[PDB]
Design a protein around this ligand. Structure first.
Ligand code: HEM
Length: 291
């Protein structure tokens, strides 16, 4: 199967910058969420979970079809704790009914990273909603109680190499884990509504202790009250991963450049852009627009 990008009828950069702006202005309006983490981390996690269902071997799943809108996929146990982010975007969809669901969910992630002072992420339109029967079965998102070889093998299905994997995991600078969603408890760091290389620095510089949490799962804990998932910790257990972690801990600019590439790639896996499709769009932040 092939999914060819189709530009929404008559839309161009300024049409999508308005939708960007509606999302960015709602992040402000709802900035009190989760005791002022705000909705940025949840929208970045949502954008990753709607794209992370892709299987490169047969082009099933992926962001193109917008299939998260179907209850089979939004009730995936792996998607627990994204329901609020979905509901955040529902009204914006109502405001711009011409945008496709996959375009909206992916653009949510881009907007969140940029409004949290992250790198600019080029973004392309033309995902097209596909019907219920194309929704991927549950189970395609990764487990957190795993080691480095699981992570490396897992991400091969998404056509991601070691640098891309370590870069994407840097998004765990954002937000936190909650027992009620995933059976893990705590944040990865202090400034968790700001996009920075803090995940790598805490991985390297904190003393971590294996502990059992209130859901009977084990996680790595620091006395500053931060945590790492077994999969996060695997990035310093593995020599190849450890080297890249060090590189991003020492250079946030390099991390931003690699994260931008990898995240755009994630959001576009499974999509064929016609040769005369438009060039990717780089949206201005509210600040750059004096908004
Ligand atoms: C082996 C890979 C992955 C695993 C096992 C993993 C695991 C999880 C865990 C279990 C949490 C907590 C969810 C909760 O309790 O609410 C979550 C949070 C999060 N993850 Fe990951 N994740 C991985 C990769 C990624 C990637 C590639 C990104 C982004 C490019 C992503 C971005 C986030 C975000 C931003 C949140 C915080 C959400 C919020 O606070 O609302 N994760 N992750």
């Amino acid at each position: 199967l092939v999914h060819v990008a189709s530009v929404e009828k008559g839309r161009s950069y300024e049409d999508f910058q308005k939708v960007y702006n509606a999302i960015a202005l709602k992040l402000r309006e709802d900035d009190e969420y989760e005791n002022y983490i705000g909705y940025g981390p949840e929208l970045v996690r949502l954008a990753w979970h709607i794209s992370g269902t892709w299987d490169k071997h047969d082009n099933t799943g992926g962001s193109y079809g917008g299939t998260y809108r179907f209850k089979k996929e939004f009730n995936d146990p792996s998607n627990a704790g994204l329901q609020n982010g979905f509901k955040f975007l529902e009204p914006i969809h109502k405001e711009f009914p011409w945008i496709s669901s996959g375009d909206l969910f992916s653009l949510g992630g881009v907007t969140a990273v940029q409004e949290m002072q992250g790198p600019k992420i080029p973004w392309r339109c033309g995902r097209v909603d596909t019907p219920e029967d194309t929704t991927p079965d549950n189970g395609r998102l990764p487990d957190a109680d795993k080691d480095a070889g699981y992570v490396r093998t897992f991400f091969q299905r998404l056509n991601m190499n070691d640098r891309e994997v370590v870069a994407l995991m840097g998004a765990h600078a954002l937000g936190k884990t909650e027992l009620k969603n995933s059976g893990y408890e705590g944040p990865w760091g202090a400034a968790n509504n700001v996009f920075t290389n803090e995940f790598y620095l805490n991985l390297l510089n904190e003393d971590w202790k294996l502990e059992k949490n209130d859901a009977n799962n084990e996680q790595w804990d620091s006395k500053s009250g931060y945590m790492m998932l077994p999969t996060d910790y695997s990035l310093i257990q593995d020599p190849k991963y450890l080297s890249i972690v060090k590189e991003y801990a020492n250079d946030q600019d390099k991390f931003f450049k690699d994260f931008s590439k990898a995240f755009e790639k994630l959001l576009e896996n499974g999509i064929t852009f016609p040769k005369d499709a438009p060039s990717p769009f780089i949206f201005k932040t509210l600040e750059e627009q004096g908004l």
